Each structure stands twice: as structure tokens, then as C-alpha cells.
């Protein structure tokens, strides 16, 4: 497992997307998570509350995913800046810095 | 003692603090090794033997 | 009508473990290549289930509780077990449920029965129908194809539940060759019926047929013989199960989350 | 894009728009071919109803539910539907329909609902909290009343414990209301649990009899043997449509499937909770439901203070193969990111002005035009 | 693929616009990171035969 | 210690799994930080008497 | 009511987790700086100023 | 909006209801802002025979 | 007031008009037995990581 | 252990590199009839 960091990055992204997909099975305090059973069973006014619950839950899920992606992007940016510094100082020159 | 102690309250409500993988004594051992190396050998021990 | 089969052959109850059995399709929905977590009345894995025998002169058809559900499994070769009885007091004072099977049909009734102590059926080979001495205030009746159909080769597994007012039955038939106890493995129980009996159930009993062919004395607790037969009773509890599904849609595997920390 | 940015000016760049939508053209309905009408008369227009303590339960199956037939016959003082809207009853199919009928007095009709308490709810007829169905009631003084009194209708008055949902207790045993035991004989502090309603035409509305019918059913999740009056249509495949399978609306493409459904299975679901498969009631063939909207769309535009023409990048489209595009153009260029429309390929290589994708960058140059 | 839910979401408000702004910023940042790391030299040097 | 609330939470969904994933990642990161800082030398050098 | 409380407490937990993630990023930056300082100042002589 | 009906049908005068009155005679919108008023008029709108 | 927990004797002193007791959260950490008029401490039974 | 009671693992007086970071200074592994060790 020489390249563990890159594979972990890929796995984290894929797992985040899969979790986002699977969080569509959450009822968020509603009668269902399908949005078609709600519309078929209930009239608009009585379905408004359930659909609002699901909208709120899925918006929260998306916001959570976005925040996690932002934090991971900050980490990756730190790694990339370190990599650029290493290219410049080790490849394009000789570094007296230790380790 | 739960309402009094904060840790007990945090712990009756699902919040736990895990112990670190390195004890303070072992970290001190690492530091002592580093000091001994930089004293006896200088900066050579960081480049090999 | 009441032949007390009070043959006195005391043997201690034998207990066995249910490795992975009693899993049933919680809902009538199709799922493939997916792991689904559901909470429902399931038989816990590796649970201590009772063992009853009908070998000779031992007959085991006592009254058992129906706390929340039953996993009834029978390793049989002669259709000696013909059905069950469910109720609270099993007397005319309260309604009771009776499930019995004639060849190629089933009889189901929810009607006040003064059940006959040591109830049973007989084999000569139709023979006898001594199960109840009365039927009053009869409300529900139903007929369908046999629930039980054809050493100990076939494993008929049944799950009984008494949700709100619907009696739900899940059944499966698995052929095997083991003759000692349950075959370690896997098999899912598909739904069979949902009877709207709408009664109260706390106790149940099994109905085993007797063989009286070579000679027939006064049919008291004598002159009868039961072919080799045994059934296992397990009580379901609210548990969270992780169910695997294959491409075809069959389960083929499951996990009991609360069994141990590893499964959780 | 301008609406998304809430501005009338778009600076030069590339923007991501809504995924490619295809609007459905047809709207099909597939109900089982049933011609028989539900036994409305036997349930609502039948003499000799049951007592509440021995409420009768009738199974209903293989019938169309056109309740409009009841408009001319009878009028219901009470009609409450739990778990379903009344307006949608005409567009739905029901799995396990049971009609629970009995007679009570008007004051006790309120007790026929989840969460209520009283003699009826606690001792005679209890509904589950998670109840899906409808409750119907109507006065029957002209029918279930007689001069001098009608005592054929009874109700349980004393019980050791409250009933469970959909539980019937016809037991007739002397109730022990005290420490002293009484064995099968009425006595002081011992009562006969059953009592008879005193129904007379003179008494008030409260004590007037009310015939109650409770319909319990599950919507979806299983084959529906009972259906509404909506009319089925022909089957359409490989085309976006607004389908209705046994009351399950939706929107998607329908195609043949290799899935095998057991007899008790009607619908199918995916990792999410979404009907990815269904069984046609009329043809008993499996179908695969697929969403019609699929594919990213990106817009390449200059500042719009310089030019109003744009180029559209359709991800998940291989033009090299009726493409899934909004509008075809003369200039089509295929890229590993997707098909690019509105931009002309130039064999030259410049610095990136607009980062389209893999190795493709657009710009505004030269009669000016967009290039890739 | 639901008109009713979409017309409700229009009322619930525009948070998805800012979600997409964040994601677009992330993507542009990734491209910038790649450029900064590898595109340190504009002259493309070929190894001698 | 409520069965009803737990059985409702099972329906509400599994976000706590990802919460715990994040917290576990944080903890492992802390251990890695300690190792990176102090465990720069595997040879343990003793100061001479 | 129970759904309201579940939603609120889940939001609280998510907020705590996000704050912990950000603080962990800050601590990771500090730890990487500390490792660089150990390597360059302790295990060697640094010509870098300050 | 004024009209006369029987008592059994007053419940039908509300959004989301169904019946002969709601479906064929007088229907209210689901997004209805207003008030509904009713009172018995047997002494007025009734006659012998 | 339903619940689930361990009940133990307490040193808390309740005024006549006080029946229940609460903690920093909104949670009944104490109670007075109506029949014996003695204070009790309610403690959750679930405790400890695994 | 200072982290807590460990059940199912046998203490070995030897010291190896960490395969499974239990806690304070304890690491587990699979070794040797194989068994879990701490
Ligand atoms: C169903 O029947 C059981 C008895 O078979 C009822 O439980 C009994 O209730 C009586 C008092 O009503 C107690 O004296 C018994 O000890 C109970 N027996 C058991 C085994 O619990 C139960 O209440 C009935 N259910 C309903 C809904 O009435
Ligand atoms: C008689 C059995 C029919 C069962 C069909 C399944 C249930 C479908 C809903 C039917 C509800 C009918 C209630 C009466 C409709 C309103 C009539 C009225 O207001 O005048
Ligand atoms: C024996 O049989 C009679 C049938 O009349 C029955 O009344 C009695 O209870 C039975 N006794 C036992 C111990 O089975
Ligand atoms: C089942 O229970 C009995 C008695 O409680 C006990 O002796 C037996 O060991 C249990 N089963 C197993 C497999 O241990
Ligand atoms: C035998 O089966 C028939 C129908 O198959 C049924 O009517 C009859 O009651 C059965 N006989 C007995 C004794 O159960
Ligand atoms: C049950 O049957 C008995 C015997 O005919 C009768 O006296 C009683 O009234 C019946 N109970 C009913 C019909 O609820
Ligand atoms: C799935 O079904 C196909 C038939 O459609 C069958 O050939 C295959 O064996 C099944 N899969 C398994 C794992 O049995
Ligand atoms: C059924 O309805 C008709 C009119 O719709 C009525 O004349 C008849 O009496 C009703 N049946 C019964 C049993 O009341
Ligand atoms: C009616 O439906 C059945 C399936 O339930 C089907 O076999 C039959 O061909 C259909 N008949 C018509 C005329 O559509
Ligand atoms: C941008 O718009 C302003 C206002 O119309 C105009 O003066 C200016 O020339 C425009 N810039 C370009 C590049 O067209
Ligand atoms: C597009 O399809 C053609 C065949 O029509 C194929 O040769 C080509 O590789 C495809 N390109 C991409 C990017 O998928
Ligand atoms: C550009 O390249 C294409 C092939 O990619 C070729 O067909 C075309 O003639 C070229 N045009 C010029 C001006 O080089
Ligand atoms: C009744 O309760 C009181 C406190 O209110 C107590 O002092 C008394 O001992 C109790 N009596 C019995 C018999 O429990
Ligand atoms: C290991 O150490 C324990 C004390 O910690 C001692 O009792 C035991 O004998 C030792 N075993 C070996 C093999 O050194």
C-alpha cells in the first residue's frame, strides 16, 4: 500500500457521495422518503409539511457534505502548497533544510 | 456526583474522552533520546547513524 | 371425546441453539444487491430454543407461552404434526384459534372452543378428531392449501405473530438429511397469510397425530404410538437485523446487531 | 445562469446550469382490469348490523371503489380519513380492505378514533395509533329504533383491562369489581359486563343510534386487489411518462427487466427509498423505472458586455456515436468532458482563457466567434 | 422530477446557490493547486537523445 | 434511555455514523501528529553517565 | 415533539463536530510546524531567520 | 358566498373534502383564506309537507 | 413522571413546595417519594465506553 | 490498562511496534493456535 494517501482521498470522496445518495432514504420525521407516496396519498396542503421536512433534511445533508468538502479541500491545499515548496526547493535546487 | 462533576455529566450523555496512544513518560523518553543525540552527536543522528 | 393420554414417561426438557434461523422478509418489497437494516420481532441468533420429542413412550405437546412470537421448526417425515392451537385459557370462556390440516386442505377457526386436555388427532388412516369438545360463538373461518406439505428430511419452519389484530404466518420448507438437530445454515421465511382474528393470545399448543394400527385396545392412554418427531420453539424479541440481498432478491445472509459487539 | 446569479450581466467564464431535463409527453395509468363494484350496499345499506362488543369484520376484494354511488342513497354525518386524503381516494388502489361495522350512540362516535378513551375505545373497539383508513358514520334512528325500546344492541361496560387495537372480546363472564369473588353468579359488587343500548325514536340525538363503518387498508407496498374508478391506458416504454401503477404516481422511463418478483411482491426499491421497479397488474410483467433527467450542462460565455453568443458543454454525451441536447448547432466538437456546441475547434494552442475541461480551453477571437 | 417539490423549494429559499459557489471554489482551487505544483516551468525541456 | 426515541432515530436516519467517522479521523490525526513531532528517531539514545 | 428534539440535538452534534474538525486542522498545522522546527532546529542548524 | 344545504353536508364545506357538494356544487381552494359560517334554519327553510 | 434509572438516598433537602429536582440540563436528577417523604437520586444506568 | 479493562487479549511482556493502537501505551496484534495479545 505504497500510495495510501491518494487512495484514502479517493475513497473519502466516493464515500461522501455514496452517503449523500443513501441519506435520501431518511424520512426526516415525515411519513416517507419517496416523495411520490406522499404526493399520491395526500393532497397538496397536507403534503406541504412532509415535503418541507424532507427538503430541510436534504438541504442539511447537502450543507454537511459541502462543509466536509471545504475542510478536506483546505487540507489538500496545505498538502499541495507543501508539494510546490518541495518541488521548488528540492527539485529546482539543493535544500539545506533537514528532513 | 453527576450534576456536580462535569465529566460525569458529559459521560452520562454519551460524550467520552479517549486516551492518547502515547503516554507522557514515553514522550519524555523520545525527547530525552533527541537531547542525548543532539548533545553527543550533534546533527549527524538526524541524517543516519 | 377426551382421551387423557396420561402416559407417564418423564424426560427433562432439552435445549438447543438456533445458529441463524427465523429470518423472514419484513415487508412485501423487492430489494437486490443491497444491505438493509430493519427492526422487527426476530429470533435472536444463537438463541436457547426448547426441544420436544414424540418418540417411543414419550409424547410432548404441552401448553407453551406466546410472549411476543414463536419460531416453530419441525423436522418430520410422516406429517405427524397437523397444526397448532392458540389462546389464553383454551376453554369456552374465551375465544381461541385453531389451525389444522386435512390432506390437501387447511381448516382455520376463531371460535369459542372448550379444548380437550391432551388434544390430538389420530392415524390408523383418517381415524380420530379429538381436539375440542365444543364450538360456540364461531366468528372466523378460512380454508387454503396445506401449510405443511411433503430420516428427518424436511424442515418446516414457521413464525407466528399477533400484531394489533392480525395473525401473521411466515413459512419455509427446506429439505435436509440431518437427523439430530437443526441444520446450521441459512433460510428465509416468506409471508403466508395475515389472519384478522382480532383476539388475545398468550398460550399455544401443538397438535400431533397418533398411530394405532397393529392392535387397538380401549383407546385410553394406551394402545397408541407416535412416530419419531420433534419440534423446536423459539421466542422472538424486538431486534435490529442487517439483511443482505442478492441479485435475485433473496436474503442469503443477515447479522444480529445486538448479539455481540462485533456484530454491532 | 443569469437567473441563478440574480444579475443581468455574466462575466466571462464557464458556469454549471441545471442537469438536462426531458419533460414527459404522455400520462399513462395501469390498474388491474376489474369490472365488479365493491359491496357498498351490503356494508352501508344492510339491515341487522352487529353490536359494538362483537363488531363484524368483512373482507373486500376484487372490486372497483366508486363511492359516488352512495351520493343518492345515504348521507354520512361523519367521514374522517386517516393516512390518506379524501380527494386522492379516486386515484388509489388499496391492498387489504376490511370493513368493520357496528352500532353505537352519537355521543360515542368521537371515541372511534386513535388516541381516544371511553367505554367504547377501552372495552369494545379500539383503533391503532398508526391507523390508515377511513371512519364513516350516519344516524339510523329510523332503522335501529323501535317504540318502547330496542335492546338488541349491546356494549361492554366493565373489563379488567383496556383492549388492544383491533381486538374483539365476546367473553360473557361476571365482572369482579371487589375483593369478594363471585363465580358465575351476579351479586353485590359483581356485574354482568354487557349492557343494552336503550334506543327509542323519542330520545335525543346523543342517545340516537349511529351506524359506524371503519375501513382499514394499506396504500402501496404490496399488490392492490381493490382499485378506484380511474381508467387504465395502454403501456408505453422507452419514453418519459407520468405513470400511475396501482395508485403510485411518478415520472420516468419504463423498460423490460430481468428482475424476478415473488407473487407477494409488487414494487421494488433501490439503495434509497425509490421505486426502481414495478409489476404491471394487467400483463404481470416487470418494468424498470429510470429517471428521465440525466447529464450535466455547462455554459461557456464571454462577459455579455462583449458578445451575447455562448457555447454549451453537455457532459455525459458522446456526439461521435437524437442526442440529449437542448439545441443542435452547425459547430460540434467532442471532448473527454463532453460534447461542446457553439464552439469551433482550432488546431492551434494558446494559454487557457476559459477552462472548459480535460485539456480544452475556449476564447473569443477573430466576425468574432467562440473557439475551443 | 417533481414540480410540486421544486415550486416549494423556490419558496424555501436559495441556499443551493451558495452551496454551488462553495463547490465551484473548491474545484477552481484544485485546478490552481495542480498548476502551482506542476506548472512551475513554462519552457518545456526535452531530454537529449 | 428511551426505546421510543431510539426507534424514531433509526427512522430519522444515520448521520451519527458519519459524525463518528469524523471524530475518529480527528483522533487518529492527533495520534499521527504526536508521532510525527516526537517520533522522528527510532534509535533511543541514552545520555552518557 | 421527539422529532423536533432529535433534529435540534443532531444539529448541535453536527456543529460540535464541524468546530472540532476546524480546530483539528489548526492543530495539525501547528503540529506540522512543530515537526519542521524539530527537524530543522534540533536535528540541524537553521539559517532561516526567526 | 351563501347557499343552503343539509347538516350532514356542512363538513364538506372545507378544503380537501369530498362528496356531492364539494365535488359537484361548491368547492373551496386548498389555499383558502377566509371563514366558514353555518347555522340551522329549520324554522325558516322548512315547510309542512 | 416515567423514566429509567437507579434510585438512591440523597443528601438534598427539598422545600415543602418542591417535589422534583433538575440539573444543568432539563432532567429529573432527584425526586421525593410521596409515600415516605424521602429524597431520591435518579442516575442513568448506561455508562461507559466500549 | 489505563484506558480500561481489556478482555479477550493476553498480556505479553514483550514489546513490538504498534499494530492496533488500543490506548495509553498498549497495542494489540495477532500472533502464534493463534490468539490476540496486548
Ligand atoms: C390477554 O390475556 C392475558 C391473560 O391470558 C391478560 O393478562 C392477564 O391479566 C389479568 C388481569 O386482567 C391478570 O390477573 C393476569 O395475571 C394476566 N396474565 C398474564 C399472563 O399477564 C391480558 O391483560 C389480556 N390482554 C388484554 C388486552 O386484555
Ligand atoms: C364498501 C366497501 C368499499 C371499500 C373501498 C375502499 C375504500 C375507498 C374509500 C371509500 C370511502 C367511501 C366513503 C363515502 C364517500 C363520501 C360519500 C358522501 O360524502 O356522501
Ligand atoms: C380425563 O378426561 C376427562 C374427560 O371427561 C376430563 O374431564 C379430565 O379433566 C381428564 N383428566 C386429565 C388429568 O387429563
Ligand atoms: C439453555 O438454558 C439451560 C438452562 O437455563 C442451560 O443449561 C443451557 O446451557 C442453555 N443452552 C446452552 C447452549 O448453553
Ligand atoms: C378433509 O378435507 C376437506 C377439504 O379438503 C375438508 O372439507 C374436511 O373437513 C377435511 N376433513 C377433516 C376431518 O378435517
Ligand atoms: C354464544 O353462544 C351461546 C350458546 O348458544 C349463547 O348463549 C351466547 O349468546 C352466544 N354469544 C354471542 C352470540 O355473542
Ligand atoms: C440469479 O438469478 C439467475 C436467473 O435469472 C440465476 O441464474 C442465478 O443463479 C441467480 N443468482 C444466484 C446467486 O443464485
Ligand atoms: C338499499 O337502498 C334502497 C334505496 O337505495 C332502499 O330502498 C333499501 O331499503 C336499502 N336496503 C335496506 C336493506 O335497507
Ligand atoms: C385482464 O388481466 C389479466 C391479468 O390479471 C390478463 O391475463 C388478461 O389478459 C386481461 N384481459 C384484458 C381483456 O385486458
Ligand atoms: C461595458 O458596458 C459599459 C456600459 O454600457 C460600456 O461603456 C463599456 O464599453 C462596456 N465594455 C465593453 C468591453 O464592451
Ligand atoms: C465516443 O464514441 C466513439 C464511438 O462512437 C468512440 O470511438 C469514442 O472513444 C467515444 N469517446 C468518448 C470520450 O467516450
Ligand atoms: C485541423 O486538424 C484537423 C484534424 O484534427 C484537420 O482535418 C484540418 O484540416 C486541420 N486544419 C488546419 C487548418 O490545420
Ligand atoms: C401513607 O402515606 C403517608 C405519607 O403521606 C405515610 O406517612 C404513611 O405511613 C403511609 N401509610 C401507609 C399504610 O403506607
Ligand atoms: C511477565 O511479567 C509478569 C509480571 O508483569 C510475570 O508475572 C510473568 O512471569 C512474566 N512472564 C514472562 C514469560 O516473562
mmCIF file of C-alpha atoms in Angstrom, chain D residues 23-232:
data_model
loop_
_atom_site.group_PDB
_atom_site.id
_atom_site.type_symbol
_atom_site.label_atom_id
_atom_site.label_comp_id
_atom_site.label_asym_id
_atom_site.label_seq_id
_atom_site.Cartn_x
_atom_site.Cartn_y
_atom_site.Cartn_z
ATOM 1 C CA UNK D 23 -40.336 16.790 -19.985
ATOM 2 C CA UNK D 24 -42.791 13.869 -20.203
ATOM 3 C CA UNK D 25 -45.175 13.775 -23.152
ATOM 4 C CA UNK D 26 -47.747 11.144 -22.125
ATOM 5 C CA UNK D 27 -49.516 10.270 -18.875
ATOM 6 C CA UNK D 28 -50.457 6.610 -18.543
ATOM 7 C CA UNK D 29 -52.472 4.688 -15.959
ATOM 8 C CA UNK D 30 -52.266 0.952 -15.247
ATOM 9 C CA UNK D 31 -54.897 -0.539 -12.949
ATOM 10 C CA UNK D 32 -55.974 -4.199 -12.828
ATOM 11 C CA UNK D 33 -58.824 -4.962 -15.217
ATOM 12 C CA UNK D 34 -61.676 -5.235 -12.712
ATOM 13 C CA UNK D 35 -65.330 -4.705 -13.629
ATOM 14 C CA UNK D 36 -67.091 -5.629 -10.374
ATOM 15 C CA UNK D 37 -68.240 -2.902 -7.983
ATOM 16 C CA UNK D 38 -67.487 -3.039 -4.283
ATOM 17 C CA UNK D 39 -70.236 -4.271 -1.930
ATOM 18 C CA UNK D 40 -71.275 -0.765 -0.921
ATOM 19 C CA UNK D 41 -74.874 -1.857 -0.414
ATOM 20 C CA UNK D 42 -74.132 -4.819 1.845
ATOM 21 C CA UNK D 43 -71.847 -2.735 4.074
ATOM 22 C CA UNK D 44 -73.754 0.572 4.202
ATOM 23 C CA UNK D 45 -77.282 -0.432 3.127
ATOM 24 C CA UNK D 46 -77.730 -3.639 5.135
ATOM 25 C CA UNK D 47 -80.172 -4.169 7.971
ATOM 26 C CA UNK D 48 -79.230 -6.042 11.133
ATOM 27 C CA UNK D 49 -75.850 -4.557 11.982
ATOM 28 C CA UNK D 50 -73.641 -6.028 14.689
ATOM 29 C CA UNK D 51 -73.152 -4.834 18.243
ATOM 30 C CA UNK D 52 -70.024 -2.860 19.071
ATOM 31 C CA UNK D 53 -68.797 -5.502 21.520
ATOM 32 C CA UNK D 54 -68.948 -8.057 18.668
ATOM 33 C CA UNK D 55 -68.071 -5.810 15.747
ATOM 34 C CA UNK D 56 -68.199 -7.659 12.440
ATOM 35 C CA UNK D 57 -65.229 -7.564 10.070
ATOM 36 C CA UNK D 58 -65.816 -8.096 6.348
ATOM 37 C CA UNK D 59 -63.128 -8.646 3.729
ATOM 38 C CA UNK D 60 -63.352 -6.687 0.480
ATOM 39 C CA UNK D 61 -61.510 -7.649 -2.691
ATOM 40 C CA UNK D 62 -61.749 -7.667 -6.483
ATOM 41 C CA UNK D 63 -63.954 -4.614 -6.837
ATOM 42 C CA UNK D 64 -63.865 -1.035 -8.072
ATOM 43 C CA UNK D 65 -64.424 1.595 -5.373
ATOM 44 C CA UNK D 66 -66.701 4.239 -6.908
ATOM 45 C CA UNK D 67 -68.184 5.817 -3.786
ATOM 46 C CA UNK D 68 -70.210 8.212 -5.953
ATOM 47 C CA UNK D 69 -72.893 5.500 -5.903
ATOM 48 C CA UNK D 70 -73.507 6.427 -2.252
ATOM 49 C CA UNK D 71 -74.411 10.050 -3.014
ATOM 50 C CA UNK D 72 -78.040 9.323 -3.902
ATOM 51 C CA UNK D 73 -78.520 6.581 -1.302
ATOM 52 C CA UNK D 74 -77.149 7.757 2.049
ATOM 53 C CA UNK D 75 -75.503 10.766 3.669
ATOM 54 C CA UNK D 76 -72.787 10.388 6.300
ATOM 55 C CA UNK D 77 -72.677 12.748 9.271
ATOM 56 C CA UNK D 78 -69.046 11.770 9.917
ATOM 57 C CA UNK D 79 -66.338 10.923 7.389
ATOM 58 C CA UNK D 80 -62.700 11.058 8.511
ATOM 59 C CA UNK D 81 -59.806 9.521 6.578
ATOM 60 C CA UNK D 82 -56.524 8.892 8.401
ATOM 61 C CA UNK D 83 -53.312 8.437 6.443
ATOM 62 C CA UNK D 84 -54.881 9.481 3.127
ATOM 63 C CA UNK D 85 -56.646 12.497 1.685
ATOM 64 C CA UNK D 86 -60.264 12.024 0.525
ATOM 65 C CA UNK D 87 -59.524 13.712 -2.805
ATOM 66 C CA UNK D 88 -56.961 11.022 -3.671
ATOM 67 C CA UNK D 89 -59.259 8.056 -2.988
ATOM 68 C CA UNK D 90 -60.300 8.088 -6.658
ATOM 69 C CA UNK D 91 -56.656 7.782 -7.799
ATOM 70 C CA UNK D 92 -55.517 4.991 -5.468
ATOM 71 C CA UNK D 93 -55.618 1.220 -5.095
ATOM 72 C CA UNK D 94 -55.932 -0.499 -1.725
ATOM 73 C CA UNK D 95 -54.204 -3.677 -0.581
ATOM 74 C CA UNK D 96 -56.072 -5.200 2.387
ATOM 75 C CA UNK D 97 -59.501 -3.608 2.763
ATOM 76 C CA UNK D 98 -61.547 -4.608 5.812
ATOM 77 C CA UNK D 99 -64.939 -3.149 6.731
ATOM 78 C CA UNK D 100 -65.596 -3.080 10.478
ATOM 79 C CA UNK D 101 -69.265 -2.381 11.185
ATOM 80 C CA UNK D 102 -71.184 -1.850 14.417
ATOM 81 C CA UNK D 103 -73.789 0.379 16.070
ATOM 82 C CA UNK D 104 -73.322 2.912 18.875
ATOM 83 C CA UNK D 105 -74.884 6.123 20.151
ATOM 84 C CA UNK D 106 -73.995 9.539 18.788
ATOM 85 C CA UNK D 107 -72.111 10.640 21.904
ATOM 86 C CA UNK D 108 -69.681 7.756 21.372
ATOM 87 C CA UNK D 109 -68.822 8.371 17.706
ATOM 88 C CA UNK D 110 -65.964 10.658 18.743
ATOM 89 C CA UNK D 111 -64.456 7.685 20.584
ATOM 90 C CA UNK D 112 -63.963 5.975 17.196
ATOM 91 C CA UNK D 113 -60.551 7.477 16.509
ATOM 92 C CA UNK D 114 -56.929 6.820 17.524
ATOM 93 C CA UNK D 115 -55.911 8.154 20.915
ATOM 94 C CA UNK D 116 -59.421 8.433 22.347
ATOM 95 C CA UNK D 117 -60.675 6.958 25.611
ATOM 96 C CA UNK D 118 -64.024 5.826 26.930
ATOM 97 C CA UNK D 119 -66.078 2.693 27.313
ATOM 98 C CA UNK D 120 -66.167 2.062 23.556
ATOM 99 C CA UNK D 121 -62.487 2.719 22.887
ATOM 100 C CA UNK D 122 -61.227 0.992 26.025
ATOM 101 C CA UNK D 123 -63.525 -2.048 26.177
ATOM 102 C CA UNK D 124 -65.367 -2.589 22.869
ATOM 103 C CA UNK D 125 -63.475 -1.291 19.820
ATOM 104 C CA UNK D 126 -60.009 0.277 19.771
ATOM 105 C CA UNK D 127 -58.162 1.691 16.779
ATOM 106 C CA UNK D 128 -54.362 1.683 16.456
ATOM 107 C CA UNK D 129 -52.499 4.959 16.762
ATOM 108 C CA UNK D 130 -50.837 4.305 13.384
ATOM 109 C CA UNK D 131 -54.181 3.823 11.661
ATOM 110 C CA UNK D 132 -54.529 4.065 7.880
ATOM 111 C CA UNK D 133 -58.139 4.118 6.756
ATOM 112 C CA UNK D 134 -61.416 5.992 6.919
ATOM 113 C CA UNK D 135 -64.187 6.218 9.514
ATOM 114 C CA UNK D 136 -67.812 6.575 8.413
ATOM 115 C CA UNK D 137 -70.967 7.061 10.465
ATOM 116 C CA UNK D 138 -74.586 8.040 9.922
ATOM 117 C CA UNK D 139 -77.700 8.220 12.072
ATOM 118 C CA UNK D 140 -80.032 5.218 11.930
ATOM 119 C CA UNK D 141 -82.843 6.224 14.279
ATOM 120 C CA UNK D 142 -85.444 5.371 11.633
ATOM 121 C CA UNK D 143 -83.953 1.855 11.376
ATOM 122 C CA UNK D 144 -82.324 0.799 14.667
ATOM 123 C CA UNK D 145 -85.052 2.292 16.886
ATOM 124 C CA UNK D 146 -88.450 0.985 17.947
ATOM 125 C CA UNK D 147 -91.375 2.175 20.033
ATOM 126 C CA UNK D 148 -90.835 1.082 23.623
ATOM 127 C CA UNK D 149 -87.124 0.424 23.116
ATOM 128 C CA UNK D 150 -84.723 -1.730 21.091
ATOM 129 C CA UNK D 151 -82.378 -3.760 23.302
ATOM 130 C CA UNK D 152 -80.772 -5.939 20.612
ATOM 131 C CA UNK D 153 -77.636 -3.754 20.551
ATOM 132 C CA UNK D 154 -75.204 -4.249 23.429
ATOM 133 C CA UNK D 155 -71.932 -2.748 24.616
ATOM 134 C CA UNK D 156 -69.280 -3.935 27.049
ATOM 135 C CA UNK D 157 -69.342 -1.807 30.198
ATOM 136 C CA UNK D 158 -66.827 -3.475 32.539
ATOM 137 C CA UNK D 159 -63.483 -5.059 31.712
ATOM 138 C CA UNK D 160 -60.365 -5.933 33.677
ATOM 139 C CA UNK D 161 -58.095 -4.115 31.215
ATOM 140 C CA UNK D 162 -58.269 -1.852 28.191
ATOM 141 C CA UNK D 163 -58.441 -3.524 24.799
ATOM 142 C CA UNK D 164 -55.623 -3.588 22.276
ATOM 143 C CA UNK D 165 -56.093 -2.282 18.726
ATOM 144 C CA UNK D 166 -58.384 -4.372 16.524
ATOM 145 C CA UNK D 167 -59.178 -6.774 19.361
ATOM 146 C CA UNK D 168 -62.606 -8.324 19.925
ATOM 147 C CA UNK D 169 -63.765 -9.565 23.339
ATOM 148 C CA UNK D 170 -67.037 -11.504 23.135
ATOM 149 C CA UNK D 171 -66.483 -13.188 26.507
ATOM 150 C CA UNK D 172 -69.551 -13.088 28.763
ATOM 151 C CA UNK D 173 -68.233 -13.578 32.298
ATOM 152 C CA UNK D 174 -69.305 -11.940 35.536
ATOM 153 C CA UNK D 175 -67.062 -8.975 36.299
ATOM 154 C CA UNK D 176 -65.456 -8.955 39.753
ATOM 155 C CA UNK D 177 -65.419 -5.332 40.921
ATOM 156 C CA UNK D 178 -64.477 -6.190 44.518
ATOM 157 C CA UNK D 179 -62.255 -8.417 46.609
ATOM 158 C CA UNK D 180 -65.087 -10.886 47.226
ATOM 159 C CA UNK D 181 -65.099 -13.434 44.368
ATOM 160 C CA UNK D 182 -68.346 -14.295 42.602
ATOM 161 C CA UNK D 183 -68.352 -17.450 40.471
ATOM 162 C CA UNK D 184 -70.717 -17.304 37.509
ATOM 163 C CA UNK D 185 -73.448 -15.560 39.509
ATOM 164 C CA UNK D 186 -74.418 -11.899 39.683
ATOM 165 C CA UNK D 187 -74.306 -10.270 43.095
ATOM 166 C CA UNK D 188 -73.473 -7.148 45.036
ATOM 167 C CA UNK D 189 -70.326 -5.524 43.613
ATOM 168 C CA UNK D 190 -70.496 -8.080 40.769
ATOM 169 C CA UNK D 191 -71.844 -7.002 37.390
ATOM 170 C CA UNK D 192 -72.711 -8.508 34.039
ATOM 171 C CA UNK D 193 -70.231 -6.810 31.673
ATOM 172 C CA UNK D 194 -72.638 -6.495 28.744
ATOM 173 C CA UNK D 195 -75.383 -3.877 28.748
ATOM 174 C CA UNK D 196 -78.049 -2.999 26.198
ATOM 175 C CA UNK D 197 -78.429 0.355 24.475
ATOM 176 C CA UNK D 198 -81.837 1.885 25.069
ATOM 177 C CA UNK D 199 -82.809 3.107 21.605
ATOM 178 C CA UNK D 200 -86.111 4.938 21.178
ATOM 179 C CA UNK D 201 -87.216 7.370 18.456
ATOM 180 C CA UNK D 202 -88.081 9.980 21.099
ATOM 181 C CA UNK D 203 -84.691 10.251 22.798
ATOM 182 C CA UNK D 204 -82.134 12.875 21.877
ATOM 183 C CA UNK D 205 -79.530 12.930 19.144
ATOM 184 C CA UNK D 206 -76.853 11.909 21.629
ATOM 185 C CA UNK D 207 -78.552 8.630 22.531
ATOM 186 C CA UNK D 208 -79.789 8.100 18.976
ATOM 187 C CA UNK D 209 -78.154 5.106 17.265
ATOM 188 C CA UNK D 210 -75.298 5.653 14.830
ATOM 189 C CA UNK D 211 -74.141 3.011 12.358
ATOM 190 C CA UNK D 212 -70.343 3.126 12.136
ATOM 191 C CA UNK D 213 -68.230 1.584 9.378
ATOM 192 C CA UNK D 214 -64.432 1.578 9.625
ATOM 193 C CA UNK D 215 -62.329 0.872 6.536
ATOM 194 C CA UNK D 216 -58.745 -0.228 7.184
ATOM 195 C CA UNK D 217 -56.272 -0.627 4.340
ATOM 196 C CA UNK D 218 -52.643 -0.219 3.343
ATOM 197 C CA UNK D 219 -51.690 2.071 0.469
ATOM 198 C CA UNK D 220 -48.890 0.806 -1.768
ATOM 199 C CA UNK D 221 -46.047 -1.520 -0.655
ATOM 200 C CA UNK D 222 -47.978 -4.589 -1.871
ATOM 201 C CA UNK D 223 -50.338 -5.825 -4.601
ATOM 202 C CA UNK D 224 -53.623 -3.920 -4.619
ATOM 203 C CA UNK D 225 -56.657 -6.140 -5.166
ATOM 204 C CA UNK D 226 -59.030 -3.151 -4.787
ATOM 205 C CA UNK D 227 -58.837 -0.104 -7.046
ATOM 206 C CA UNK D 228 -60.616 3.160 -7.707
ATOM 207 C CA UNK D 229 -62.735 4.186 -10.693
ATOM 208 C CA UNK D 230 -59.810 5.641 -12.658
ATOM 209 C CA UNK D 231 -59.411 4.167 -16.133
ATOM 210 C CA UNK D 232 -56.286 2.344 -17.267
#
